[PDB]
Homo-oligomer: A and B are copies of this chain.
Amino acid sequence: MISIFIAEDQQMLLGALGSLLNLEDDMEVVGKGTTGQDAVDFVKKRQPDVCIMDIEMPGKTGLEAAEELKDTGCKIIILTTFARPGYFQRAIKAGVKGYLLKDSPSEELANAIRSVMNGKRIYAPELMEDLY
């Protein structure tokens, strides 16, 4: 069973993502948060296998949270509206294992969690497609 923490400031989306992932037999949402701090606190304390991280959240962004969790051993997958090369470069330098867009098909999220748990790096193809 893969343990997942979800950090997403928009409650409707946070609740819907937890519901989308609890559909999976080999996955479990162990906690939900709305800020970068909620992610840092849970991940350092509860140590879930995976953290689904939104970027733009109040207080501390998901990129800032990812930097604070760089040496924790948790596999961070960024899930954001923003296809920004600066956000992506800061995310990869922080050691994130994935970077997905909120415009990626929903099925790609559970797939990315399994891939990342298998040591793979998952970046939405839509990113390169947006830039070029």
Contact = CB atoms under 8 A, between A and B. Distances in A.
Interface of A: 9-20, 23, 79, 81, 100-109
B23 A104 contact: no
Nearest to A16: B16
A17 B13 CA distance: 8
23 contacts: A10-B81, A10-B103, A11-B102, A11-B104, A11-B105, A11-B106, A12-B100, A12-B102, A12-B104, A12-B108, A13-B13, A13-B16, A15-B105, A15-B106, A16-B16, A16-B17, A16-B20, A16-B106, A18-B106, A19-B19, A19-B23, A19-B106, A20-B20
Q: Which of A10, A16, A81, A100 has the most B CB atoms < 10 Å from its CB? A: A16
A12 B13 CA distance: 9
Which 3 A-B pairs give the minimum distances between C-beta atoms?
A15-B106, A16-B16, A16-B20
Contacts of A105: 11-12, 15
Contacts of A109: 12
A11 B79 CA distance: 12
Nearest to A124: B12
